[PDB]
């Protein structure tokens with residue numbers, strides 16, 4: 001079939017770093033993909049990690065092409081955009097929506113962790129929605145291997161985004177990868193349910209973080225969160241990463257397992 005490898009770049013989807021993401025549409029088939037354009041003036045590791053990934057709640061990597069110094073990553077197009085834009089400031093979103101997004105986020109993170117990959121920058125800007133509002137973890141530029149040949153490596157590079165980062169990353173030279181991603185998922189849940197972030201960073205000089213440690217959940221954002229999800233947050237947002245709840249136990253949590261949401265036409269007679 002002639003022309004089937006030709007794609008028109010038709011819309012800017014995002015920028016940041018020294019790159020852009022373009023909506024690309026196939027000339028023949030009209031398939032829409034996202035193309036991440038990175039001018040190499042790191043991306044080899046991101047491509048390598050991307051090639052490992054095959055799960056319904058992770059942005060699919062289709063392949064890559066390089067033309068000189070511009071590298072092209074072909075990725076699953078997510079027409080719903082960022083979870084960030086489903087969060088109403090100071091409100092959040094309906095609790096059943098947040099629970100459903102949280103389920104899909106856990107499935108994605110369970111998958112990455114089982115193949116030994118940590119994302120390291122989980123936040124609503126990096127959680128994309130397809131046309132059916134299915135959540136997809138995106139952007140593996142800060143991602144790394146924390147397990148190989150069944151042997152765990154401790155991390156020591158400070159990275160991520162301060163309001164989402166686990167306190168051990170600010171306090172300790174080395175830390176386990178998995179509790180860090182769990183923590184950031186808890187801050188995402190807090191955001192979805194309160195429409196605000198609890199602190200600038202989880203440090204002993206952050207008053208809002210100190211209030212949480214002192215259990216002042218009569219304050220915001222906690223006062224906006226029902227007691228059931230708040231009880232999950234109490235288990236996730238635990239300062240000691242060894243005492244923090246693990247994903248297997250998140251999946252046994254009462255709120256996590258609470259029926260809340262009807263499924264996604266019909267007629268009467």
Ligand SMILES: Nc1ncc(-c2cccc(O)c2)nc1-c1ccc(C(=O)O)cc1
Nearest residue numbers: 013034075076077078081082138139140
């Ligand atoms: N794969 C994607 N699909 C949709 C959108 C997007 C993001 C915001 C608004 C919008 O309408 C679309 N963004 C991407 C995307 C996001 C991040 C990456 C990445 O690997 O950095 C690659 C692609």
